[PDB]
Amino acid sequence: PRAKTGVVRRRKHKKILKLAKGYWGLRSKSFRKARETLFAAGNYAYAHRKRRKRDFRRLWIVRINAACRQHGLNYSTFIHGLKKAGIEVDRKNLADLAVREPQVFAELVERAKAAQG
């Protein structure tokens, strides 16, 4: 018989109240469109953690180009350098070092120019 699903939904909904952080006035408490706006945000963070990869890709990309070239020769060149390069060829730091240990870059370099030849 009975079935005052009330209890339930009042709940499901406040849940939603939180789901909704405190977005742009109206799509904030916006129950409905709130939820919606959310689905959005969802697929969004989606895209987000998804590609942040390429994000860095570039990040360093440039930071480093910045340094390698600043020194003597861009990517085809420098890169190819670490390339010919033997039991030593890393990346997720080329930047790092270029930065932190000026020497570090200056020489990773030196050898590298040679690395190519």
Binding site: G42, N43, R49, D90, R91, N93
Partner: protein
């Protein structure tokens, strides 16, 4: 000190800190266990030189424990196209407390 060896994808460049990185849950089957990462990117406070030899020489090791875990965050799969379902971020590693060398 700040040295570079890296693992599972370059998890490194550090000193003695609980710098938690990736799940190499193998010696993890024991709390603060120890283990080495083959260098590559040998460089410490003045003496800076080669990742080849990093690939082939000294290694470093840690004493580690703990894990981390599911780190909240969720992801809902929907398409304007007419649908939506979603879940929580499950990730971790027993984390490392750094052993010099």
């Amino acid at each position: 000190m700040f040295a570079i060896v890296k693992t599972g994808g370059k998890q490194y460049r550090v000193e003695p800190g609980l710098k938690l990185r990736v799940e190499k849950l193998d010696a993890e089957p024991g709390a603060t266990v120890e283990l080495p990462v083959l260098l590559l990117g040998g460089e410490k406070t003045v003496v800076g030189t080669p990742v080849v030899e990093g690939a082939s020489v000294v290694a470093e090791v840690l004493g580690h424990g703990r894990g981390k875990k599911i780190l909240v965050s969720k992801f809902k799969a929907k398409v304007q196209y007419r649908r939506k379902k979603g879940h929580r971020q499950p990730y971790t590693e027993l984390l490392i407390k750094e052993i010099r060398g």
